[PDB]
Amino acid sequence: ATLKDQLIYNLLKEEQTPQNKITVVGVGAVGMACAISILMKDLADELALVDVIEDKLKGEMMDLQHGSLFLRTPKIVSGKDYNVTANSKLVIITAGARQQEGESRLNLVQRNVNIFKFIIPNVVKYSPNCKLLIVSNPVDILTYVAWKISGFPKNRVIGSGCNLDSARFRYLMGERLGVHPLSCHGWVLGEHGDSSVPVWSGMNVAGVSLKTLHPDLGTDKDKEQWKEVHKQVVESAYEVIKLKGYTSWAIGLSVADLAESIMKNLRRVHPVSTMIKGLYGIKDDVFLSVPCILGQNGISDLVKVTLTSEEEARLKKSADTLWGIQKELQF
Amino acid sequence: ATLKDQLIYNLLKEEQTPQNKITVVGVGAVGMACAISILMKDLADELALVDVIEDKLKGEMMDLQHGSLFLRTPKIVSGKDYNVTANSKLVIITAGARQQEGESRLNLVQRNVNIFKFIIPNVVKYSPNCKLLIVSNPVDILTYVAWKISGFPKNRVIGSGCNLDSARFRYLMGERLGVHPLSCHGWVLGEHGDSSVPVWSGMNVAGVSLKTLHPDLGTDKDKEQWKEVHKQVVESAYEVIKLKGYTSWAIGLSVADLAESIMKNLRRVHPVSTMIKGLYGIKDDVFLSVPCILGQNGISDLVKVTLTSEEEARLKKSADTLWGIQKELQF
Amino acid sequence: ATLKDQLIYNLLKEEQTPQNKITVVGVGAVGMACAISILMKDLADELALVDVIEDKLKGEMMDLQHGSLFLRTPKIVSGKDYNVTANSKLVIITAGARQQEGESRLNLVQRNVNIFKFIIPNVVKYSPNCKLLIVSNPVDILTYVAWKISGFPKNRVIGSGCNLDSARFRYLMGERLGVHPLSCHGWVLGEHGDSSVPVWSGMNVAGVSLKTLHPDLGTDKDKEQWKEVHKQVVESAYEVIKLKGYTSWAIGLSVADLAESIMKNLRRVHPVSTMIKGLYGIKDDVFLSVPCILGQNGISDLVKVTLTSEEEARLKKSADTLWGIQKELQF
Amino acid sequence: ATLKDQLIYNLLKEEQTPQNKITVVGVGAVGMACAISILMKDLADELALVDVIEDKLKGEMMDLQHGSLFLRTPKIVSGKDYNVTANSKLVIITAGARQQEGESRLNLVQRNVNIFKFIIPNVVKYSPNCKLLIVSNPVDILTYVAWKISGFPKNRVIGSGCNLDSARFRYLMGERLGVHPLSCHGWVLGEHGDSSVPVWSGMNVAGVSLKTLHPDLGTDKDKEQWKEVHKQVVESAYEVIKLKGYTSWAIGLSVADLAESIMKNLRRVHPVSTMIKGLYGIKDDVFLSVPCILGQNGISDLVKVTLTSEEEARLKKSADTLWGIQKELQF
Ligand SMILES: NC(=O)C1=CN([C@@H]2O[C@H](COP(=O)(O)OP(=O)(O)OC[C@H]3O[C@@H](n4cnc5c(N)ncnc54)[C@H](O)[C@@H]3O)[C@@H](O)[C@H]2O)C=CC1
Ligand SMILES: NC(=O)C1=CN([C@@H]2O[C@H](COP(=O)(O)OP(=O)(O)OC[C@H]3O[C@@H](n4cnc5c(N)ncnc54)[C@H](O)[C@@H]3O)[C@@H](O)[C@H]2O)C=CC1
Ligand SMILES: NC(=O)C1=CN([C@@H]2O[C@H](COP(=O)(O)OP(=O)(O)OC[C@H]3O[C@@H](n4cnc5c(N)ncnc54)[C@H](O)[C@@H]3O)[C@@H](O)[C@H]2O)C=CC1
Ligand SMILES: NC(=O)C1=CN([C@@H]2O[C@H](COP(=O)(O)OP(=O)(O)OC[C@H]3O[C@@H](n4cnc5c(N)ncnc54)[C@H](O)[C@@H]3O)[C@@H](O)[C@H]2O)C=CC1
C-alpha cells in the first residue's frame, strides 16, 4: 500500500479527456513566446508541444513544467508524434525557416510549403475539428496553403496576418500622441509584409478622424510625415531581426491575443489572414488581412472596410503580388 | 499648429517619476524571461533593461515595445547607461556567464564576481532605495557579493535561491500524487545547487505529514525511494541545460513570483537566500535559502524551520561548502 | 440592405453552443457575489442567471450586461425557465429562503428542500452532465438533498462546505502571525459552521507544525488561546450577519475558487462537502467537508486526514445529527 | 517566548507606509461593487473603507477580510474617522442619496452637496496629494463641488461621468451588430444624465464610420432607428432601478476601469467629468464628460472631439442646465 493510497482515497480511476487544449508545433523563438504568453493568460487546460528536434522539445517542455506551480495550466505534453495533439481546440503553427537580415518573408515560401505538407495532414488527423492559426512566414500564403492541404472550411484556417502590424502601428501612433495604444485606433491591412496597407481614413482617437483634422495625413505632402509611421511598421521587423537576430515577444503576445478571442468566443475584431476572394475586385483565392470577427468557430464574419481609390489599389496590388506566388506553388 | 494640438488640449506639464519601476539587468535568456513574466503580471508601470551588448538590448527593448497594445506597462526603456535605471523599486540582476553541460554553478563565481564589481555600484547609485533581486549564478554567493558591494541592509538584498528548487520539488511531488503543485507542500532549503536540503519533516498534503504516514520517506530504506525526487530536483537544471542549452522559463516565473510578493507587499513566505549567520550554529556570513517573509521592504522576517538532526547536518554542510568560497573572495 | 449587412459580411450560418457555461441559481446577495467573482475571473464563456423573482432577475442580469465592456464573458443570460441553463458545465445553487438572522441551519431545512425539489430536476433536465455546487444552507444537508433528487454520482455533487471556514481560518491565522493567508496553512473540516473541526495538527507555516512548536495549541490551557482563532471562525460569521444583515463577498470569492479548480481541471485540494460514508467510522449517507481534489469531473479523489479520536468523535457526532434530520425530510 | 517568536525571526521593526492605497467613501451598493472590482483587479496594496453607519461599515470590512486568501490586497481597513484614509493615492466618493424610481439624478444635488461639505475637507486633510474620483449623483455637479471645496487643481478631481454611459452604448451597439463591445466604438458625452450627447460621427467598427455608411444614423428619418440606442442608454439606469432597486455592478466595473488607468498611469482615454470652460463656447465653471487622458496625475489632457453643429448645440444645452443648478448653488 503506497504512501499515496494511504493518503488519497480515489473515487474514480483512469478517466480523462481534454476540454480547452492548445497545441503549438515549432518550439523555436516564436513557438515558445506563444506558449509562455498563452500559459500566463490562462487560455488552455492542456498545452501540447511538437517539433522535430527531440531534445530541444523535451527541454522546452521540462522548463515549462518546472514553473507549473506559478501557472493554471495543469497538463503540458510534448513529442514528435502528433498523437500528443489529439483533440486540440486550437493549433498554432510556428515551425519553419525564419528570415535572414534583409530577407523578404516571401523568400521562405518554398522551404516552409515543403514542411507544411507533413505538418498540416498530421495536425488534422488528431484534431479534425480544430481551428488552425498560422504564424510561419510568409503567413498570408501559408494560411492559403494550410487551407488547401487540410480541407478545412476557411473559417477554421486563420493567419497571424496584420494583428502584429496594426499593434505596431498603434504603438507608434500612441508614441507620437502621448496616448496609450489601447486608446489609439488605426488599421494596417493586406499582406503581413512589405505591401501592407495603412487605412488612413479610419485612423482616429476617441472617434475623431485624424485624416479629417489633418488632411495631408498619409501623403507625401504631409508636413508631419505620418507616412513614416507605416514605414516604420514595415521596416520594424527588419530592424528587430538586424538588432537581435529574430522577432519573438510581440508576435507571441499577438498570437495570445488571437487565441484569447478564439478560446473565449469573444467575437472581437482583428485583422487576420483570410480568403478575401470577392471583395475589392479580387477574383482569386488570395489570402490577406482584413478585420475579421474571431470566436469559437474561427472567422465567422469579415468587416467590409470602405477604402479610398488609392487604398483599394494598394490592397489589390498586394493581392497581385501574393497570388503570383500562390499561382506556381507546388504541393 | 500640429495635428497633436488640434486633437489634444494639454493641462499638465512634465510631472513624471515612476511609482512601481522594475529594472532587469542583462537581456539574455533569463533576463528576458523575467521581463515577459513581469509584464504579463502587471507588476510594473515602468520596466527598464540594461546590457553591455547595445545591439541585443535595443532589439529586445523594441520587441517588447511592439507588444505594448497587449500589456499594461506604459513605459519600456533600455540603455547601456544605468541612468535609465533611476528610481527602480526592484532591480533584477541576471547578467553573467551561465553553466555549460555538467559545469557546477560554483565554477562561475570568479567570472561573475567580476561582472558584479561593475554592475552593483552602478545599480545602487541610481536606485539607493531599491530591493536587489539576484539571479546570476552561483546565486547564494552573488547575493553575499552583492550585499558586500552595495552597502545595503540585508533585508534589501535577495537571492532567487531555492524558490525555483521548491517549485520543482512541488511539481514532482504533485506528479507522483496526482495533485496540483499548489496543493503539494515541501521545502528545498540551503544552496540553490548540488547541496540543497529537502525538509522531509514538513512535506505534507492538506496538512498531513507524509513523513508520519511513511517513516521511511526520504531514506535509503524507503521502498518508494522518495529521496529520488530531491535527486531529480538537484539533477534537473543539468538535464534541461543538456537538452536545450540553458534554462529560462521556470526561473522567469520564479522571479515574477518573488517580484509579485515584493511589489505588492504580500508578506508571503518564500525560500530565498539571505544572511543566516546566527541560525543553526553557523557563525560566518553565509547566504543561503531559508523561508522568508517577502514584502515592500524585501526580507522582513525569517521562519526558523524546525530541522531534524540530519537535515541540520546537511544544511550546516551546505553552508561550509558555500563559506569555503566566500572567505577566499577578493573584491 | 441593413447597416449591419453593409458593414459586415457573414460566413458562418447558425453556429454556436456554449463551451464553458456556468449557471447561478438564486440572485440574492450570495448568488450575485458568486456571479461577479466568476465574471471577473474569466471562468465562463456564458453565464446564466435564474430565480423566481422575475423583476430582480432581469435587473441584475441587465446590470451585469451594462458592464460587458470590462469583461471577457460574451454572453450573459437569465430567465425563470431553465432552458437558459442548457449545457452548463457547472451549476451553482444559492437559492433558498435565506436562513434567519439568528437560528442555525435546520428548523427551515424542509422549506429549502421543497425549493430543491423544483430546482434540481429542471437543472438536471437541461444539463444532465454538469457538476452541481451547492451553497444553500444548511449546505451539508442540502448537498445530500441535491444528490438524492439529482441522481448524480457523488463525484458531481459538491457542497461549498468548509472552503470558506478554512479561508476564514487562514485569514485569522495570518493576522496573528503577520503572514499572508496564502502562506498560512490550516484546515477546518466537517460541518460548515457551528460544529466545524479545526485540525490543529495541520496548522503550519512553511512546513513547521505549530502544534509541535506549541503543544498547548487548541487546548483550553493555551496561554496564547489559539482555540479562540476557531471560535472566531464560527462567531465572525454571526458577527457579519448581525452587522450587515448577511454575508456575501467572502462566500462569493470562495465559490469562484472552487469554480476555478473545477472549470480548469486544476486538481487542487479544497475542503468541500462530499459523501463521506465509509470514512472515520461513518455508516450513513452523509456529506461533510473533507479535503477533496477538484477537477473537470468534480471530486475525483479525497485526502484521508489522520484525525485524533477526539476529532473523529466530532465528525461522527455531526454525521449522527445530520442523518437524523435527513430521514425526517420529505422529498 | 511566544509561538510567533519561536516561529518567526524578525529582521525589520519600523516598517510601514502604503504605496498604492485606495479609499472608498460610502459602503453602499455602489461602494462595495467598487471595492470588490478594485480588489479583484489587484489595483491596491491597501484598501480603506469609510461610512457613517458603523455597523454596516464593520461588517463589510470583515466580509471582505474573510476573502483575503483569494485576493492580493494584504490590508483592508475601515473607520468612521478619516485617519484610516491617510496617504491614499486615490479616494472614491460614493456616499449619498440615490434616486428612487423615476427620480432625476439632479434632484439629489442639495442633499448630497451637504454631505460633501463634510466628506471632502476630511478627505483633503488626510490625503492632500490624492486623486478624487467622484461617483455620487449628480456626478457632474458633485465633481465641481468636490473641486471647489478641496482646492485641488482640476486635474486631480475626476467624475466617473459618462464612462458608464459609453460602456452601455457600446454594449447596445455590439448587441445590434453581433460584435463584442471591445470592438464597438462610440462616445456619449456631456451630462451623465438625461441630457447626454451621442457623438454619432465617431461611432465605428474597425475605423469604418457608421455615419458614413448610413447617413440617416441618429436621425429621426433613420428607418433602422439607431437613435433608440441612445434613448436606451439614457433610460437604462431608470429601468434597472425600477427592476432591482438601484444600479451597482456596471458602475463598479466602470470605476475599476478608471482606477486602473489612474493607478497604473496608462494614459487611456476615458469620458469623465472635468471642467470644460472655454471649449464649445462654454464660459462657466461647468463640469461634464469629455474624452480625457487619465494617468497617475489624474486628467493630464483633454480630447477636442469635432462636434457637428447639432451635437455642439446639444452639448452646450447639456452644460447650461447643469450650470443653472450650479449657479443657484450656495456653499
Ligand atoms: N507572422 C509573424 O508575425 C511572425 C512569423 N515568424 C515566422 O515563424 C517561423 C518560425 O520563427 P522562429 O521561431 O524565430 O524560428 P526558430 O528557428 O527559432 O524555430 C523554428 C522551429 O520549427 C522547427 N521545425 C522545422 N521544421 C519543422 C517541422 N516539419 N515540423 C516541426 N517543427 C519544425 C524547428 O525545429 C524550430 O524549432 C518563421 O517562418 C518566422 O518567419 C517569426 C516572427 C513572427
Ligand atoms: N538562480 C537560478 O535559478 C538561475 C540562474 N541562471 C544564471 O543567470 C545568468 C544568465 O543566464 P542566461 O540568461 O542564460 O545567460 P545569457 O548568455 O543568455 O545572457 C547573459 C546576458 O548578460 C550580459 N552580460 C555579460 N556580462 C555583462 C556585464 N558586465 N554587464 C551587463 N551585462 C552583461 C550578456 O550580454 C547577456 O545578454 C547565469 O549566471 C545563469 O547561471 C540561469 C537559470 C536559472
Ligand atoms: N455555504 C456558505 O458558506 C453560506 C451559505 N449561505 C446561504 O445561501 C443562500 C442564499 O443566501 P442569500 O442570497 O444571502 O439570501 P437571499 O434570500 O437574498 O437569496 C435567496 C434567493 O433564492 C431565490 N429563491 C427562492 N426559491 C427559489 C426557487 N425555486 N428558484 C429560484 N430561486 C429561488 C430567492 O428568490 C433569492 O433571490 C442561503 O440559503 C444562505 O443561508 C449564505 C452565506 C454563507
Ligand atoms: N455616477 C454613476 O454612474 C453612479 C452613481 N450612483 C450614485 O452613488 C451614490 C450611492 O449609491 P448607493 O451605493 O446605491 O446608495 P446606498 O444607500 O446603497 O449607500 C450609500 C452610502 O453612503 C453613506 N453615507 C451617507 N452620508 C455619508 C457620509 N458623510 N459619509 C460617509 N458615508 C455616507 C450611506 O450611509 C450609504 O452607506 C448615489 O449618489 C448614486 O446615485 C449610483 C450608480 C452609479
Author numbering:
A (entry chain B), B (entry chain A), C (entry chain C), D (entry chain D): 1 to 331
What does the report in the manuscript say about this coordinate set?
Lactate dehydrogenase (LDH) is a tetrameric enzyme composed of four subunits. The 1,4-dihydronicotinamide adenine dinucleotide (NADH)-dependent enzyme LDHA mediates a redox reaction for the reduction of pyruvate to lactate at the end of glycolysis when the cytosolic NADH/nicotinamide adenine dinucleotide (NAD+) ratio is high, which is a crucial step for regenerating NAD+, and is needed to maintain glycolysis for the survival of cancer cells. Full-length LDHA is composed of 331 amino acids and includes a nucleotide binding region (residues 28–56). In our structural study, the X-ray crystal structure of purified human LDHA showed a tetrameric complex consisting of 4 LDHA subunits (LDH-5).
The LDHA structure with NADH and malonate was solved at a 2.4 Å resolution, and the LDHA tetramer occurred in space group P21. Eight NADH molecules were in the large active co-substrate-binding pockets, and eight malonate molecules were located in small active substrate-binding pockets of the two LDHA tetramer. Each NADH binds to a monomer of the LDHA tetramer in about α6 and α10 helices. Negatively charged NADH and malonate substrates were in the tunnel-type groove inside the positively charged surface. The NADH adenosine and pyrophosphate unit were located at the opening of the tunnel cavity. The NADH nicotinamide moiety and malonate were within closed cavities, and they interacted with each other. In addition, NADH interacted with hydrophobic (A29, V30, A97, and V135), polar (N112, N137, S160, and H192), and charged residues (D51, K56, and R98) of LDHA. The active-site loop near NADH and malonate was in an active closed conformation. In complexes of LDHA and NADH or malonate, the polar LDHA amino acids N137 and H192 are important residues for interactions with substrates through hydrogen bonding. The structures of LDHA with malonate and NADH were shown in an active closed conformation, whereas LDHA with inhibitor-MA showed in an inactive open conformation.
